[PDB]
Amino acid sequence: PQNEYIEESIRKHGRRFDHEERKRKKAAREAHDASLYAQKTRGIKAKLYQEKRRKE
Amino acid sequence: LGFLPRKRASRQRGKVKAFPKDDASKPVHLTAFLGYKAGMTHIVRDLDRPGSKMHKREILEAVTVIETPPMVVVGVVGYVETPRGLRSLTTVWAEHLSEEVKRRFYKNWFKSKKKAFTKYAKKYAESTQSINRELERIKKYCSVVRVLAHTQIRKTPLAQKKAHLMEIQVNGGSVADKVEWAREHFEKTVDIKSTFEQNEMIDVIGVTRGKGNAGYMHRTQLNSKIYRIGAGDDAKNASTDFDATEKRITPMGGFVRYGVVENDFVMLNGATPGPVKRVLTLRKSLLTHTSRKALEPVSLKWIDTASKFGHGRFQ
Amino acid sequence: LRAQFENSNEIGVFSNLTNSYALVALGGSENFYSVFEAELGDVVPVVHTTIGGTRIIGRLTCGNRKGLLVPSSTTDNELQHLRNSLPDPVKIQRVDERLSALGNIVACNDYVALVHPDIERETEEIIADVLDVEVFRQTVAGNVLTGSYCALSNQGALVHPRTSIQEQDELSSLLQVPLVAGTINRGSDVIGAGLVVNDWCAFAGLDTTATELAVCESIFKL
Amino acid sequence: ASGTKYRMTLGLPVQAIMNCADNSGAKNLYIVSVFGTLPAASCGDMVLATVKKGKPDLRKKIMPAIVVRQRKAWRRKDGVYLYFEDNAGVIVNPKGEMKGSAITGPVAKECADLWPRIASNAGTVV
Amino acid sequence: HFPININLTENGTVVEIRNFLGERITRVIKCLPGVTVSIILEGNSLENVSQSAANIKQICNVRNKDIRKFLDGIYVSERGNIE
Amino acid sequence: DVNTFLDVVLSRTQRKTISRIRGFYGRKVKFTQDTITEKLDSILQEKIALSQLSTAKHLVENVARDYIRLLKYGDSLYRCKQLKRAALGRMATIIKRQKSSLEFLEQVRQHLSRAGVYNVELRDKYILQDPSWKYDRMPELLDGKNVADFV
Amino acid sequence: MRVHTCYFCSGPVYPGHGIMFVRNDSKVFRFCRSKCHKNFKMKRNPRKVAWTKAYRKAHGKEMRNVPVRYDRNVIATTLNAMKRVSQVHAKRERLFYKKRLA
RNA sequence: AUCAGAAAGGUGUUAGUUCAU
RNA sequence: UCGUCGCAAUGGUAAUUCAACUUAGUACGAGAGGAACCGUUGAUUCAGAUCAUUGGUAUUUGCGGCCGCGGAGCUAUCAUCUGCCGGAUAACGGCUGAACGCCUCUAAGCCAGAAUCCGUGCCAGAAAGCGACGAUU
RNA sequence: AUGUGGAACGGGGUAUUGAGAUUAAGCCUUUGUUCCCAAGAUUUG
Incomplete structure (x- = not known):
């Protein structure tokens, strides 16, 4: 519509009933996902992912 | 590469490499039939397909007519499944053997002494204990049952005097139930009318006709629905109830390369491999499709009996 | 009464709405028929009779409440079946109209089933007799086939906007009912094809021009 | 346009003079650049056609031509390929509505079904 | 906007979801053995209930739809002990 | 994002991966600059300081393009890579220009945010005295005859 | 379904066979066979062809659009009328067979 | 080791060390 | 020995590439434009056929007057046409569940999900595979 | 490899061409006719 239609x-x-639970579950899984993605990273993306992790 | 290499068919009569899955709950019934393609004719049938562009309209389409005389069960074959494949445990033939089957069993019908299976027929008449023991073993040990029957070659107007005998697997019921059904149907003629209700889609297997020095290759067309399964004795087999007009399905002046069909015949839409007067095998589809085309009933409106030979003008 | 013919808006072409029995067709848009059913379809029986084996019965047969004038191509037995299928007041007879789309040719108005200007007098007379409503040669929207180009009914024979005021009046006098010039079927010259005008209620196209839908109702006083 | 697409004869083929049956001031309409371009348009399918005869503005400028009839043999309800009187393509607007006032000559039933305005234009449908 | 119709069959062993965001195709989900759904599902196996709930959530999923805007769907409200 | 677009351009160069190789390195840098220019054009499609930053990014892209041309002239693999790195260094300046541009672009984005099977027939609804006979297949085509025509 | 009459050969026309032609004057012409269609395309006079039935009739060598209630008996009665006409046609054919020999 | 075997990262382990409580 | 009918180790492999209408002319969307799925209409490509339908070709080279054509048969994006199956799972997202009393696509497990793969179907058949079975100099 | 035996013709039917002729040749069929033959050798336990 107009202005912040989604907020209105x-x-x-x-909001979603399980929006907070899904965010908490995703946040908890973020630590596992980051290590798993780095281990499974391959090719040029592996170098980019490693560089991003090293920079961070 | 699907059809490569292109080689001539090793068998003149089409052999089904597979059969529909049998169900124990379903009643014991046949799953395949053999017929001789007489020719193709143009017929007009109403297209009662909902949602189609030409719904409730009559369409002129090709109909393939193949003579399907009743088949007499010569015998039964008991195949026992094994880890290495399907093993034929034994086969039992009836005491009485048809002359055409005996003629087919020998490469020299006139030169033969007709001694084929003479001892087996004599032994069966002398003592049926071995047959009963063999039948009991098949019903108790064999896992696959195939019934051997010979087509009515003499009834059909074919120069060949040898019946196109073939073995058809039995689907439905238990092994003992199939054995009992085979024993009841042993040395008995089975018509295609009981097997097929002419209201379903089946598959036709046949060898294509060569075209000189490309052809003579076995094919198995699918999604073929029988339009009309008539009986030769009935004069209304080729005539619909819409306008009566009883007439024969044969074209005027005789069918092209077939002559006159007098036994039971089945007409289905579409073309099939092989020329006229060619043996074709019709069997139920292994996979069932719930499409509207395969489910809508087929009702022929007009059947053209004009002279296929030449340029016919009168039905 | 606006009624879109499924993707299109040619409700009148598919169904010649007729206060006695709307000349619906086999394969015609259910939504257009149902909306026509809601408008006057209870009084105007929408029998899905494919006139001449065409999904556009209203274009094919001049389905007036006095009767439906099927084309000459349509079989007499099929018309006899169609006339029997439709209500007795709305008789679907095979008018000897040279136009295969006789209903498009002949303005399917219950008071007078005004025939196409290109349609011959014998075709007009046959259209008049088959539809039991007078068929005078009329060219709505500059188109000889007034039946598709003019939303015809006893209450109102609304012409397309492409038709002049005199041309709409000419179609009005030919169909013996008022003819408001409204271009039905998305503003096209097809008023009668877009709008299924019936004496009980002049149906129209939902996707068609709103002014034409109002014109069809205004001509029919609905 | 409308109607079910099928392998039927096309009255308004590309680079073919589909006569402008619809009274747009054009007698004929050749499809220099047929709309949706064997590029061809069936009976009632509006193919952009430059007027071969009649209106000069429509001439040499591809304008939609809803084929009134297909001269080539078109499958009928029975599937029998039936050849109409002519391949006349009634002039249609860009939206598909018949641009011409009234379609003349033979207008096949497919032309009427494809475009309701062509059905309105089809004063003598054949 | 469009309410979702839920139908229970075979004492709740089969769940049919219709008119899910206007969808005209009904989704059929078979409940795990030992679990009865009447939506409250009760059973003696917690894992079976959890798997069935995940399947129901998976069935009632919006594809190519805005999650923030379109909040229609099925979510588990609570889970505990029957007794 | 601008960095993502640069990464996408780098990814495209990675996906693609002496004098001929030197030209390829320059072409890859030029293609990356073209992608950056395309991103700038897309940003323009999606002014003042933003236009100046876009012009600054284009100027840095031209420097990268000049280094890309130097990469082609640098037939040696190290020479081609060195000029390619200079294009990357120029691309870094474009990123610095993009840094101000992205903030303006982010503000612009924030401002923007703020059934087929049906058959019918009137014969079923026939008002005939013999409507059942009407639905019944009356004599129509006796082997293609005119039985219906006679009716 | 309607069995049309050939324009050249003056014979019955069945679906799938024959050729149908439409003229500018909304005239429909049917050809029984390719030869009849070729003869029609050649402007051959039907009365000038020995094999044509029109010549046989006009040489001394030979002798309902109103709708009604949809009844199958009416169609059957119409079919019976056609059978009666066929018997009369057979008698006319008998005259045609003898007269054509003369 | 889910490529075994005969620069580094790892919600990768193995043994662990040191420091905190 | 002559065979006759079957089985399948094994490989090729098949259907393929896209759509629209219906669905719904609506979920979304102020509305308009336009939802997944359903069937239909198809466009294909490829393969399988056949000459019924359609055109020609055509040694009925047959006919009627070298022409005017040609039956049969062949041929076809020139014709009429017919035309795959569920899994394993990839990407991908999970549920539950340790390490990390929880949590945690995961380390246990339970999953969902691909024109891919495997199956499946078709084709051929180990010339140096097999079974049943007849006669038996 | 002695009988609907087949194979040939005689044809008919059938269409073609435009009633006639060729008329199955990869159009059909034959209460018609005769010919040949209860084969000629070979292979093989």
């Missing part, structure tokens, strides 16, 4: 709809109706 969320305030009027409500």
Whole structure:
């Protein structure tokens, strides 16, 4: 619609029931995903991923 | 590469490399049939297909007519499955053997002494204990049952005097139930009318006709639905109930390379491999499709009996 | 009454709405027929009779409430079946109209089933007799086939906007009912094809021009 | 246009003079650049056609031509390829509606079904 | 906007979901053995209930739809002991 | 993002991967500059300081393109790589120009954010005295005859 | 279904066979065979062809659009009328067979 | 080792060391 | 020995590339434009066929007057046409569940999910595979 | 390899061409006719 339609709809109706739970689950799995992705990284993307991890 | 290499068919009569899966719950029934393709004719049938562009409209399409006389069960074959494959444990033939089957069994019908299976027929008449023991073993040990039957070559107007005998696997019921059904149907004629209701899609297997110095290759067309399975005795086999007009399915002046068909015949839409007067095998499809075309009933409106030979003008 | 013919808006072409029995066709848009059913279809029986084996019965047969004028190509027995299939007041007879789309040719108006200007007098007379409503030669929207180019009904024979005021009046006098010039079927010259005008209620196309839909109702006083 | 696509004869083929049956001031309409271009347009399929005869503005400028009839043999309801009187292509607008006032000559039923305006134009449908 | 119709068959062993965001294709999910669904699902196997809930959530999933905008779907509210 | 676009350009060069190799290295750098220019054009499709930053990015891209031309002239693999690194160094300056541009681009983005089987027939609904006979297959084509025509 | 009459050969026309032609004056012409179509395309006079039935009739060598209620009996009655006409046609054919010999 | 075997990273282990509580 | 009918180790491999309408002319969307899935309409490509339908070709080289054509048969994106199956899972996202009393696509497990793969179907058949079976100089 | 035996013709039917002729040759069929033959050798336990 106009302005923040998504924000207005969320305030009027409500957010997802499991939005917080999914975010918490994703955040917990982030530590496992980062190590797994680095281990499974291959090719030029592996060098880029390693460089990004080293820089961070 | 699917058809490569292109080689001539090793068998004049089409052999089905596979059969539909048998169900114990379903009743014992046949799954294949043999017929001789008489020719192809143009017929008009109403297309009662919902959602089609020409729904409730009559369409002129090619119909392939193959004579399907009743087949007499010569005997039964008991194949026992093994880890190395399907092993034929034994085969039992009826006491009475047809002359055409005996003629087919020998390369020299006139020169033969007709001694084929003479001892077996004599032994069966002398003592049926071995046959019962063999039948019991098949019903108790064999896992695959195939019924051997010979086509009515003499009834059909074919120069060949040898019946196109073939073995068809039995699908339905238990091994004992199949054995009992085979024993009941032993030395008995089985018509295609009981096997096929002419309201389903089946597969036709046949050898293509060569075209001189490309052809003579076995093919198995699928998604073929029988349009009309008529009986030669009935005069209304080729005539629909829409306008009566009883007539023979044969074209005026005789069918092209076939002559006149007098036994039971089945007409299905579409073309099939092989020329006229060629043996073809019709069997139920192994895989069942619930398509509208395969489920909608087929009702012929007009059947053209015009002279296929030459340029016919009168039906 | 706006009624889109599925993807298109040619409700009148598919079904010649007729206060006695709307001349619907086999394969015609269900939504267009159902919306026509809601408007006057209870009074105007929408029998899905494919006139001449065509999904556009309204284009093929001049389905007036006094009767439906099927084309000359349509079989007499098929018309006899179609006339029997439709209500007795709306008789679907095989008018000897040279146009295979006789209903497109002949303005399917219940009061007078105004025939196409290109349609011959014998074709017009046959269209008049088959539809039991007078068939005068009329060219709606500059198109000889007024039946598709004019939303014809006893209440109103609304012409397409392409038709002049005199041309709409000419189609009006030919169909013996008012003819408001409204271009049905998405603004096209096909008023009658887009809009299924019936005496009980002049249906139209949902995807068609809103002004034409109003013109069809205004001509039919609906 | 409308109608079910099929392997049927096309009245308005590309580089073919589909006569502009619709009364747009054009007698004929040759498809220099047929719309949706064996590029061809069936009976009622609006192919952009430059007027071969009649209107000069439509001439040498591809304008949609909803084929009134297909001169080539077109499969009928029975599937029998039936050849109409002519390959006349009634002039249609860019939206597919018949640009011409009234289609003349033989207008096949496919032309009427493809475009309701062509059906309106088809004063003598054949 | 379009309510989702849920149908239970075979004492809740089969669940049919219709009109899910307007979808005209009904999704059929077979419940795990020992679990009955009436949506509250009760059973003697916690893993079977969890797997069935995941399958129901997977069935009622929006594809190529905005998660933030379109909040329609099926989510587990709570899970505990029957007794 | 601008860095993602540069990474995408680098990824395209990686996907693609003496004098001929030197030209390929220059072409890859030029293609990366072309992709950066395409990204700048897309940003323009999606002004003032932003245009100046885009012009600054284009100027740095031209420097990278000049280094790309130097890469082609650098037939030696090390020479081609050295000039390619100079293009990357020029691309770094483009990223510095993009840094201000992306902030303006991010603000612009924030401002923008703020069934087929149906058959019918009137014969079923026939009002005939013999509607059942109407639905029934009356004599129509006796082996293709005119039985229906007679009716 | 309707069995049309050939324009040249004056014979019955069945679906799938024959050729149908449409003229500018909304005239429909049917050819029984390719030779009849070729004769029609050659502007051959039907009365000038010995094999044509039109010449046989016009040489001394030979002798309902109203709709109704849809009844299968009406179609059967019409078919019976066609059978009666066929018997009369057979009598006419008998005259045609003898007169053509003369 | 899910490429065994005969620069580095690892929600990779193996043994662990040191420091914190 | 002559065979007759079957089995399948093994390989090739098949259907293929895209669509639209219906669906719904609606979920989304202020509305308009336009939802997954359903069937239909197809466009293909390839393969399988056949000459019924369609055109020609055509040694009925047959006919009627070298021409005017040609039956049969052949041929076809010149014709009429017919035309695959579920899994394993990839990418991908999971659920539950340790390490990390929880959590945690995962280390246990349970999964979902690809024109891919494997199966499956078709084709051929180990010339140096097999079975049943007849007669038996 | 002695009988619907087959193979040949005689044909008919059949279409062609435009009623006639060729008329199955990869159009059909034959209560028609006769010919040949209860084969000629070979292979093989």
